[PDB]
CSV table of C-alpha atoms and ligand atoms in Angstrom, one decimal:
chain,number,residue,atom,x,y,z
A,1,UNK,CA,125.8,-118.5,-14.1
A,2,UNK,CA,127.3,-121.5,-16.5
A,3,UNK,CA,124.4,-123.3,-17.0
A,4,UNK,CA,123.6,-127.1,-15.9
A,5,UNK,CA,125.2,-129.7,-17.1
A,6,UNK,CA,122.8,-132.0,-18.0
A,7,UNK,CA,125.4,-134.7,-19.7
A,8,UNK,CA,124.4,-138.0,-19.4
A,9,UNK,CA,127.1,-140.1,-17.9
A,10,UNK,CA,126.6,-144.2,-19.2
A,11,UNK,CA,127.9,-147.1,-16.9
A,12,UNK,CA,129.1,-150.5,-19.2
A,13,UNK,CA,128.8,-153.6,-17.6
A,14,UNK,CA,132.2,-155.0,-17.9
A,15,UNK,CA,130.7,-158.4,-20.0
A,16,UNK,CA,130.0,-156.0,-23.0
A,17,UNK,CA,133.3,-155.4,-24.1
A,18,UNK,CA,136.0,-157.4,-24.9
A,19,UNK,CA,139.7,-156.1,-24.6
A,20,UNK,CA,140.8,-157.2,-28.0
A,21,UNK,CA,143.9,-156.1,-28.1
A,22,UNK,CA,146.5,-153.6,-26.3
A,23,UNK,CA,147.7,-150.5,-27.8
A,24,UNK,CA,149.8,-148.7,-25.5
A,25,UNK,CA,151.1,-148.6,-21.9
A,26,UNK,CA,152.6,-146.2,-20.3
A,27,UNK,CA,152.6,-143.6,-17.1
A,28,UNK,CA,148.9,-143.4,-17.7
A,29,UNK,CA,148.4,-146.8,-17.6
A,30,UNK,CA,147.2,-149.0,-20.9
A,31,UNK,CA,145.1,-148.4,-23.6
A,32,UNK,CA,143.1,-151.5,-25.0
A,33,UNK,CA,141.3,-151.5,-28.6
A,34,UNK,CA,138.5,-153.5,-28.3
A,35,UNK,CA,134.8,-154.5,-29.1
A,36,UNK,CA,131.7,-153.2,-27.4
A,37,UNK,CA,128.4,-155.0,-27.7
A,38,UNK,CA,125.4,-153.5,-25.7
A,39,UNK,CA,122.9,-156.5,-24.8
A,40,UNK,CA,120.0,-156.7,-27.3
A,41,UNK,CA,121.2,-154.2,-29.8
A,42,UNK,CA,122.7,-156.4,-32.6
A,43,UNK,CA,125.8,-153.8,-33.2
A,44,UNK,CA,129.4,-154.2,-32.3
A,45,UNK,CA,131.4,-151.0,-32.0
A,46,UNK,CA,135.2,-150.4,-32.2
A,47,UNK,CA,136.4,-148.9,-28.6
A,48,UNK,CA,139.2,-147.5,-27.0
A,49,UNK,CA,139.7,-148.5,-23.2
A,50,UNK,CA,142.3,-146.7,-20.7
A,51,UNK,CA,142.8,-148.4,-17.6
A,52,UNK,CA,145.2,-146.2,-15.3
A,53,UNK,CA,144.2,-148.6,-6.6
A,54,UNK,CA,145.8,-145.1,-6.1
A,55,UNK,CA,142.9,-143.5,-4.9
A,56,UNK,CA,144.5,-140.6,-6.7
A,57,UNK,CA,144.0,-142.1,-10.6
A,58,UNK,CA,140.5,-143.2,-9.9
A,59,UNK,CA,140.2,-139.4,-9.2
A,60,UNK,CA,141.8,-138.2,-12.6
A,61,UNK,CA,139.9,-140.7,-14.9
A,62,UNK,CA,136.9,-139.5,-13.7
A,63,UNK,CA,137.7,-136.1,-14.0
A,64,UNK,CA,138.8,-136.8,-18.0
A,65,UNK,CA,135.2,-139.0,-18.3
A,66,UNK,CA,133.7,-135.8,-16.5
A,67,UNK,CA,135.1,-133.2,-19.5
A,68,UNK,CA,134.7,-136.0,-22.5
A,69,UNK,CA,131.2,-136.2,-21.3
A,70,UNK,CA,130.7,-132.9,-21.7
A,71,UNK,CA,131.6,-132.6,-25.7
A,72,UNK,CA,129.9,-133.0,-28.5
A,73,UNK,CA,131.7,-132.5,-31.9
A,74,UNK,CA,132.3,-134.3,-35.4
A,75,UNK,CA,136.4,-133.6,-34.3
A,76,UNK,CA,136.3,-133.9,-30.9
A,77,UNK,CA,136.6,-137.5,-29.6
A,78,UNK,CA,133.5,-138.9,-28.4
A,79,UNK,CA,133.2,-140.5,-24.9
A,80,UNK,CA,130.9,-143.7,-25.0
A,81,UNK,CA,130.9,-144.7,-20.6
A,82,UNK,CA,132.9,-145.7,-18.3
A,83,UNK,CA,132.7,-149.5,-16.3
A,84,UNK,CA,132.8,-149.6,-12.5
A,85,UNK,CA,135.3,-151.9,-12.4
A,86,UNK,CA,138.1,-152.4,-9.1
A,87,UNK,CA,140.1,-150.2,-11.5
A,88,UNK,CA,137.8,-147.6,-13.3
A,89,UNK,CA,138.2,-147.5,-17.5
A,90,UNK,CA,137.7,-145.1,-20.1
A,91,UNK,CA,135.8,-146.2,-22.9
A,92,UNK,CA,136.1,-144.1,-26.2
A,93,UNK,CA,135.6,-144.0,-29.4
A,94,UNK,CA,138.4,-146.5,-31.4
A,95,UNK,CA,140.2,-144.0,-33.8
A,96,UNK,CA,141.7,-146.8,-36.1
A,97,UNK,CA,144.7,-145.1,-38.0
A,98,UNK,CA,146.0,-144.1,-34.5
A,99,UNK,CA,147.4,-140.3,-33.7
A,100,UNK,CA,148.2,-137.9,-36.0
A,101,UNK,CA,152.1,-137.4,-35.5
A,102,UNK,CA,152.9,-140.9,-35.7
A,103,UNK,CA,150.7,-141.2,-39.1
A,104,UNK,CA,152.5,-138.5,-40.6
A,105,UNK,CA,155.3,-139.8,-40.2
A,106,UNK,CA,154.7,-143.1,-40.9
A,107,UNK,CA,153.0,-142.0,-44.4
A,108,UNK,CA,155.5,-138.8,-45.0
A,109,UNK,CA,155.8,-139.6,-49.1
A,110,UNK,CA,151.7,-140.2,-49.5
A,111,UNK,CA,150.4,-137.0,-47.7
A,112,UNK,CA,149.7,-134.0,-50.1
A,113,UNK,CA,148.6,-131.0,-49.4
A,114,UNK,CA,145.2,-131.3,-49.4
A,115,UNK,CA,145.4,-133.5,-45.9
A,116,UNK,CA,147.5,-131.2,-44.5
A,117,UNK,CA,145.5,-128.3,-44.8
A,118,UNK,CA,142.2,-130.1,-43.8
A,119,UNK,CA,143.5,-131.4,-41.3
A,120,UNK,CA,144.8,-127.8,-39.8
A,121,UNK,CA,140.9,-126.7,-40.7
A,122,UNK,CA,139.2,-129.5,-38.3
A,123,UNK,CA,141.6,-129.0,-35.9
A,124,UNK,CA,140.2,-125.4,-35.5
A,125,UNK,CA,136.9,-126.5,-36.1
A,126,UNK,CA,137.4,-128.8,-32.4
A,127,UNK,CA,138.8,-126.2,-30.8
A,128,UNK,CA,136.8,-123.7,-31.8
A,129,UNK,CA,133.9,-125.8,-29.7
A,130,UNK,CA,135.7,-126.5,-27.1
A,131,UNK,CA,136.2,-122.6,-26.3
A,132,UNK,CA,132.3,-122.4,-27.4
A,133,UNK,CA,132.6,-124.6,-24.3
A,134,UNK,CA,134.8,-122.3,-22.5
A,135,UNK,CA,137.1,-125.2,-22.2
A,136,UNK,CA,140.8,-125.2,-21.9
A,137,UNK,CA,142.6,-128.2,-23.9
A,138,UNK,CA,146.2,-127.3,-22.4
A,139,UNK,CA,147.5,-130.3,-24.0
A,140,UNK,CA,146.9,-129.6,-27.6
A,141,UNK,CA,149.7,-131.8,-30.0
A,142,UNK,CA,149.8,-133.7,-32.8
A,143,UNK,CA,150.5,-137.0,-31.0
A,144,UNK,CA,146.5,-136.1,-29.2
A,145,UNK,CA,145.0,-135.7,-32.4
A,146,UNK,CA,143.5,-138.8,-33.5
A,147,UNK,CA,142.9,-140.2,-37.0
A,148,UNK,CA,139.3,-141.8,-37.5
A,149,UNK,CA,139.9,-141.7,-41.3
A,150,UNK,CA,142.5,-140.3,-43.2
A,151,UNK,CA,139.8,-137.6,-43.8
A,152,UNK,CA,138.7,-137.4,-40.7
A,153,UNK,CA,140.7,-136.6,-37.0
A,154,UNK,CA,139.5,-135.6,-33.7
A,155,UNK,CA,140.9,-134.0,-30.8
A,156,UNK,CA,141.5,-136.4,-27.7
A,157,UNK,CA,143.5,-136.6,-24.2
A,158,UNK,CA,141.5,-134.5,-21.7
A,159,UNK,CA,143.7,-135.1,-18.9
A,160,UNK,CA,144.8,-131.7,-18.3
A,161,UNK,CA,141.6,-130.3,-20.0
A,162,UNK,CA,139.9,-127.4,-17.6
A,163,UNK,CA,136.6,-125.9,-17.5
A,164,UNK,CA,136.2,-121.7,-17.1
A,165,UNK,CA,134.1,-120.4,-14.7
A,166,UNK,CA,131.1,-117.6,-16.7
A,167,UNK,CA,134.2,-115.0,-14.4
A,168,UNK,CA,137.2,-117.1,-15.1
A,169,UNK,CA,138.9,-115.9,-18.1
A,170,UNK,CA,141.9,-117.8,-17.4
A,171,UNK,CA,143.0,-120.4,-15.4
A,172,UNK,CA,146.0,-120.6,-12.8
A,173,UNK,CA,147.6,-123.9,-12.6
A,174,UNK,CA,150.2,-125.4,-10.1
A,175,UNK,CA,152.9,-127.7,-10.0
A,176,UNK,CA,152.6,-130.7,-12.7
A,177,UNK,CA,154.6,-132.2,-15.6
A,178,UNK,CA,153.7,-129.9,-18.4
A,179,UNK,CA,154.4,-130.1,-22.0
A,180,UNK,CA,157.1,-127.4,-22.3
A,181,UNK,CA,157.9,-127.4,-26.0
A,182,UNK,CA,154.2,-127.1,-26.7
A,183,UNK,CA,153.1,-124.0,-24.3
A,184,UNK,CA,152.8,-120.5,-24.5
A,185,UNK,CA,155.5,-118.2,-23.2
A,186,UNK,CA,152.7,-117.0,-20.2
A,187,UNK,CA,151.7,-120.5,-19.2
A,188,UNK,CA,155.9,-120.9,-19.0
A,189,UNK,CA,156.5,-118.7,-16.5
A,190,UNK,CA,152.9,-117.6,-14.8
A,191,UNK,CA,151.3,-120.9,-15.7
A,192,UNK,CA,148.4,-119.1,-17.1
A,193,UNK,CA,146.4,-121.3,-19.8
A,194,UNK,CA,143.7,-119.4,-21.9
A,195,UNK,CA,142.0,-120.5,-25.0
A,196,UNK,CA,144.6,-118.3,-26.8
A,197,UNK,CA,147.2,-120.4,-24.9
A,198,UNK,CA,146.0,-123.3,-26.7
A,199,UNK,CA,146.1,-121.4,-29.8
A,200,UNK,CA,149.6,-121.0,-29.1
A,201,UNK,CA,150.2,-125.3,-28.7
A,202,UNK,CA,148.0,-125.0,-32.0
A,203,UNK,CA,150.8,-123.3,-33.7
A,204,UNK,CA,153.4,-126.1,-32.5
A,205,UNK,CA,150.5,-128.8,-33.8
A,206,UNK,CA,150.9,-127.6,-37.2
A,207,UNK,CA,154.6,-127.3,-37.3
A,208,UNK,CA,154.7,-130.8,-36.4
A,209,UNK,CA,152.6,-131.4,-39.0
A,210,UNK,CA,154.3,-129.4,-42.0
A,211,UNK,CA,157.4,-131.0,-41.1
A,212,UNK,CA,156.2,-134.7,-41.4
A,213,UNK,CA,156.2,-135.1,-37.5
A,214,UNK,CA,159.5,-133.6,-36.5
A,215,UNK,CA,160.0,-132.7,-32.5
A,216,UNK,CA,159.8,-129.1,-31.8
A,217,UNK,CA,163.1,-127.8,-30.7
A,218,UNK,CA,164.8,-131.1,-31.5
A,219,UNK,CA,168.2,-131.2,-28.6
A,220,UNK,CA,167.4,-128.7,-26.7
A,221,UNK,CA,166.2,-129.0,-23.2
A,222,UNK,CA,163.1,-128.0,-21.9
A,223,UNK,CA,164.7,-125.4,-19.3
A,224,UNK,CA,166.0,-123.4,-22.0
A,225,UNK,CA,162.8,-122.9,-23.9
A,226,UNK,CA,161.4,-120.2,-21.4
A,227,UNK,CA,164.5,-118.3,-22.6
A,228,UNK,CA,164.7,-119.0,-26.1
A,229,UNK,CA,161.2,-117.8,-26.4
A,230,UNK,CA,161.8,-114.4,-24.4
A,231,UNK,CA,164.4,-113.4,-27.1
A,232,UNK,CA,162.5,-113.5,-29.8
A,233,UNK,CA,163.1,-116.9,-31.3
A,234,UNK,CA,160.5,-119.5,-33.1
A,235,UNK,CA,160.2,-122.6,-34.4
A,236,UNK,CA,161.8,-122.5,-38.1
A,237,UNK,CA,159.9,-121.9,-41.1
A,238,UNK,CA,159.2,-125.7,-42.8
A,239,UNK,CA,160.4,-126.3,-46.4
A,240,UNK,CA,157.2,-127.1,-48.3
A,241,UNK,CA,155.2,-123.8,-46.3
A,242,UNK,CA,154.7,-120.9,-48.4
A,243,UNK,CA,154.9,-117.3,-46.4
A,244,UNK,CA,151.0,-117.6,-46.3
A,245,UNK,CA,151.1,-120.7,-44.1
A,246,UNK,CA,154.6,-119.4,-42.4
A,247,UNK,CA,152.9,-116.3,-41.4
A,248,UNK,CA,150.0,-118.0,-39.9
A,249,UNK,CA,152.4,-119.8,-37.1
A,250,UNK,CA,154.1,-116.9,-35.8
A,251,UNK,CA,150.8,-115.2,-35.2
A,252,UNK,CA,150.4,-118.3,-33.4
A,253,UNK,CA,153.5,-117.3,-31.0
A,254,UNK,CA,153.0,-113.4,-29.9
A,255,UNK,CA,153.8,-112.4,-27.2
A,256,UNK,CA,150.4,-110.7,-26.3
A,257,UNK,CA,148.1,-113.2,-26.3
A,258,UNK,CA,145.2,-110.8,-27.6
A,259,UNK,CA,147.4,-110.3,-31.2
A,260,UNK,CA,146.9,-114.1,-31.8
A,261,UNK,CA,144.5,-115.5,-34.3
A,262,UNK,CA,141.0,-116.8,-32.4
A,263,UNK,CA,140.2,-120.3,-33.6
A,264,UNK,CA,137.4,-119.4,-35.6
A,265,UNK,CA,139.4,-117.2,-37.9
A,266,UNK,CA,141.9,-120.2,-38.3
A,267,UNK,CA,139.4,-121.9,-39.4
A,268,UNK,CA,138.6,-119.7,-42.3
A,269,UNK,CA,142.0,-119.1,-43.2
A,270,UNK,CA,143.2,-122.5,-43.5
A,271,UNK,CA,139.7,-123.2,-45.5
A,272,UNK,CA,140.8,-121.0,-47.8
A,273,UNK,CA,144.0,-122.4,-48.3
A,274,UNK,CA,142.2,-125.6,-48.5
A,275,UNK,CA,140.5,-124.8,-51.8
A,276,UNK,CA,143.8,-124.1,-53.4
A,277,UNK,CA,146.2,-126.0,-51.6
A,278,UNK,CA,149.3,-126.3,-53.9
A,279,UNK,CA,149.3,-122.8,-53.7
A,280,UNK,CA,150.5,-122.8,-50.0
A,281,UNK,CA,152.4,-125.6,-49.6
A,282,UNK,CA,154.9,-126.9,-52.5
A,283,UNK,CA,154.9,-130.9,-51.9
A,284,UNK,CA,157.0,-133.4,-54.5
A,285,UNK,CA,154.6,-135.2,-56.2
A,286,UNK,CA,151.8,-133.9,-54.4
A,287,UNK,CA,149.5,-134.4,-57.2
A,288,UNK,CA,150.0,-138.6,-57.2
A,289,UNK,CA,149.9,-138.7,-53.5
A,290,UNK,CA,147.1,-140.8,-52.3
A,291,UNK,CA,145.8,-142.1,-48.9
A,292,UNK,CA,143.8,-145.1,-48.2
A,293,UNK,CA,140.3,-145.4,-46.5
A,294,UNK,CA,138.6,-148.5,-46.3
A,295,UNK,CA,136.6,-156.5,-43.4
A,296,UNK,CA,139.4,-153.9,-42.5
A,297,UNK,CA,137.2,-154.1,-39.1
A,298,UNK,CA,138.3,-158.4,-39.2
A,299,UNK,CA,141.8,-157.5,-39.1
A,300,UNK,CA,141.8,-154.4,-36.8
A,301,UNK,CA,140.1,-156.6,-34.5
A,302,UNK,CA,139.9,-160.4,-34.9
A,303,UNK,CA,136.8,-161.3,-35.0
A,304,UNK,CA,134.8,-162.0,-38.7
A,305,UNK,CA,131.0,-161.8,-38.2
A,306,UNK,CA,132.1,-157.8,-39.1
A,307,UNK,CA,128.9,-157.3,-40.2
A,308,UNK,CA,126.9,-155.4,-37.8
A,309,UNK,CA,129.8,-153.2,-37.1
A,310,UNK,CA,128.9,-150.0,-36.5
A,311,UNK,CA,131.3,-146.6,-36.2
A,312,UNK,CA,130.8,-144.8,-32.7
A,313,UNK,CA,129.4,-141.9,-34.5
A,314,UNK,CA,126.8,-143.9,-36.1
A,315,UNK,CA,125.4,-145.7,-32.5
A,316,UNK,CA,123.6,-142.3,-30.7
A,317,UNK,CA,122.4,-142.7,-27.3
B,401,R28,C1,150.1,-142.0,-31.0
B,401,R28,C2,149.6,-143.1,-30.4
B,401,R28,C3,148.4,-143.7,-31.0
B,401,R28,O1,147.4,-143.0,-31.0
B,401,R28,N1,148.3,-145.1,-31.4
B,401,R28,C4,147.2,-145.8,-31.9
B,401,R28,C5,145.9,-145.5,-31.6
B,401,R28,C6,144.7,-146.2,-32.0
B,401,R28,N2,143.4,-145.8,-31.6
B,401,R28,C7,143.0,-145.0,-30.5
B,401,R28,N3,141.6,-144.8,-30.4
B,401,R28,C8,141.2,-144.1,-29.4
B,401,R28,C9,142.0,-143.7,-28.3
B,401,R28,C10,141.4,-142.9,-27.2
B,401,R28,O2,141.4,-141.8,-27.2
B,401,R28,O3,140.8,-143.5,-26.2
B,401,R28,C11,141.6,-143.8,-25.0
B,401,R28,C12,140.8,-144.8,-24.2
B,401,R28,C13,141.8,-142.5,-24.3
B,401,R28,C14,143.4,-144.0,-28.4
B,401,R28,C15,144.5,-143.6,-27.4
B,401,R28,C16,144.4,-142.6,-26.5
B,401,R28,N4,145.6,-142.6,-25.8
B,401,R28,C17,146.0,-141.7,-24.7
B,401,R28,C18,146.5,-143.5,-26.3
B,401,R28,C19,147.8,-143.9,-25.9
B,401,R28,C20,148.4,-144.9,-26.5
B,401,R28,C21,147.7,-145.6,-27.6
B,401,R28,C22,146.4,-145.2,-27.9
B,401,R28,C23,145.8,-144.2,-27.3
B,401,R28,N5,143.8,-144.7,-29.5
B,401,R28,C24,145.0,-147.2,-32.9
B,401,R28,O4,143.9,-147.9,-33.4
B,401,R28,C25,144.1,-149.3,-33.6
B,401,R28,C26,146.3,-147.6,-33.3
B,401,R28,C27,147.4,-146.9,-32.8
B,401,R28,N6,148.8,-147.3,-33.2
B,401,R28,C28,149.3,-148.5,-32.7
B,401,R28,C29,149.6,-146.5,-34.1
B,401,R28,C30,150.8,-147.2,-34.8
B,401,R28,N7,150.4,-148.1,-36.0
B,401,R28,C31,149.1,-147.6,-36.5
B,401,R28,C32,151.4,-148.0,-37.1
């Protein structure tokens, strides 16, 4: 008893979108940015295109257009269609300032704490709709946290994201290459990922982010994380987090999964914290920091004639 799905799934004829440029290769395959012109409609929107004929990646694309189909959310990264190509591509939303870990630690000296706390309150506010969703990220990091505007990020890859049955509470996995460093101690050894699993990769998400992008146990190797978890030990406490923020982490990491925060009370926490946030996190210069936010469309793609541009977000079915 879940309820229909009743998401519309669009179909791009390959001659409306131009790869522009590539962004990214890699096991998945390549990521384009590009332009997306529907016929008629005088817009051109930004995009994002992943193409992965292994029967088998036809089959997980379609799965991840399935799930991005299905969401809906100002920080959640919105899916525009997919084109029926011999290869089958993903066609998103272009985030411009690219993922979150590489922009912080590309703009470490320029990122007060303002941004940092925001940034930790729409985080929540994504996954808090996802589990409104009842669905399971399992692959929530700061490198699939995408930056639309330096005020604005949304939550992206959906490759390993799940769906709960109205009985399934939790979902047993199988074999699979599985971000270690960023899982709970249950989905470690049981391979059990719940919503408060994710909380648990949300944790990691915002240490990476309080340190400026750092790796989550930096040297040591995976196989010992299982281990170093079961004895008690956590990620470190970062130098500019207070207690307050410190204490917010480890809740993040209990062992019973029940005795960690539910998204929607990170979200008021961390809003809290945002309307005082030199309180809770002592930044250097913090208070000269500044971040841009802008024509920048000509150079991120090419093309001039910019003018009937139009964001993702702005161009509703
Ligand atoms: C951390 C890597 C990165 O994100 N780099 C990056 C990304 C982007 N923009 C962008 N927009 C949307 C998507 C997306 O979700 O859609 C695809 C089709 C799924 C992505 C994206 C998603 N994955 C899995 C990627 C893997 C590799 C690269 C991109 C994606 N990305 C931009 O916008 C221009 C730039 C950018 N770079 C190069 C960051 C480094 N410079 C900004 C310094």
């Amino acid at each position: 008893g879940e309820a229909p799905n009743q998401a519309l799934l669009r179909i791009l004829k390959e001659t409306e979108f131009k790869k522009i440029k590539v962004l990214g290769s890699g096991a998945f395959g390549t990521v384009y940015k590009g332009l997306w012109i529907p016929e008629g409609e005088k817009v051109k929107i930004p995009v994002a295109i992943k193409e992965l004929t292994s029967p088998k990646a036809n089959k997980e694309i379609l799965d991840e257009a399935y799930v991005m189909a299905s969401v809906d959310n100002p920080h959640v990264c919105r899916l525009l269609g997919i084109c029926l190509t011999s290869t089958v591509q993903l066609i998103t939303q272009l985030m411009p300032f690219g993922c979150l870990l590489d922009y912080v630690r590309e703009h470490k000296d320029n990122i007060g704490s303002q941004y940092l706390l925001n940034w930790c309150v729409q985080i929540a506010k994504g996954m808090n709709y996802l589990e409104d969703r009842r669905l399971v990220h399992r692959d929530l990091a700061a490198r699939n946290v995408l930056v639309k505007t330096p005020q604005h990020v949304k939550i992206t890859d959906f490759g390993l994201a799940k769906l709960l049955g109205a009985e399934e509470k939790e979902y047993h996995a199988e074999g699979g290459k599985v971000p270690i460093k960023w899982m709970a101690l249950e989905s470690i050894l049981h391979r059990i990922y719940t919503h408060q699993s994710d909380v648990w990769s949300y944790g990691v998400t915002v240490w990476e982010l309080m340190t400026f992008g750092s790796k989550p146990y930096d040297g040591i190797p995976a196989s010992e994380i299982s281990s170093i978890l079961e004895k008690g030990e956590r990620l470190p406490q970062p130098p500019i987090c207070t207690i307050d923020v410190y204490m917010i982490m480890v809740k993040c990491w209990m062992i019973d999964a029940d005795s960690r925060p539910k998204f929607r009370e990170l979200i008021i926490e961390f809003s809290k914290m945002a309307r005082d946030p030199q309180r809770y996190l002592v930044i250097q210069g913090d208070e000269r920091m500044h971040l841009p936010s802008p024509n920048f469309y000509r150079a991120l793609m090419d093309e001039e004639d910019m003018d009937d541009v139009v964001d993702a977000d702005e161009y509703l079915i």
